[PDB]
């Protein structure tokens, strides 16, 4: 797109941020992320949106809090989180961003919805 760049991606480590490894965060990585990561429709969400490559120069004009499963995975692996709610919120940021940027019925929106369906099935069974 010519001098077009992507923002730097979200941090996946912060040494001055309080961290914990809860039973619920282990399940988020072990169940909820391994499940969605393997899914047939995961691929658009496994890394930050490459707006340069995909030729989407308004992406990061509309989406100011980007999130993707690549980011979430690295955060879960690097024990970035204090609790499972922080993580679940990143998942919801990723789905909402997609629904914001795109329009109902778009292939991408069907992919996100399939993944979100699956997300929620798995999160129902989050151990206390």
């Amino acid at each position: 797109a010519m001098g077009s760049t992507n923002p730097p991606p979200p941090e996946t480590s912060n040494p001055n941020k309080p961290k914990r490894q809860t039973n619920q965060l282990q399940y988020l990585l072990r169940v909820v992320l391994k499940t969605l990561w393997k899914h047939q429709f995961a691929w658009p969400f496994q890394q930050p949106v490459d707006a340069v490559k995909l030729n989407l120069p308004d992406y990061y004009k509309i989406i100011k809090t980007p999130m993707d499963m690549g980011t979430i995975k690295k955060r879960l692996e690097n024990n970035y989180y204090w609790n499972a709610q922080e993580c679940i919120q990143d998942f919801n940021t990723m789905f909402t961003n997609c629904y914001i940027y795109n329009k109902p019925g778009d292939d991408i929106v069907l992919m996100a919805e399939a993944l979100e369906k699956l997300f929620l099935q798995k999160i129902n069974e989050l151990p206390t």
């Binding site: 995909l54 989407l56 308004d58 940027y101 795109n102 778009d106 292939d107 991408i108």
Partner: peptide
């Protein structure tokens, strides 16, 4: 097709 297209994402915009």
């Amino acid at each position: 097709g297209g994402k915009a």
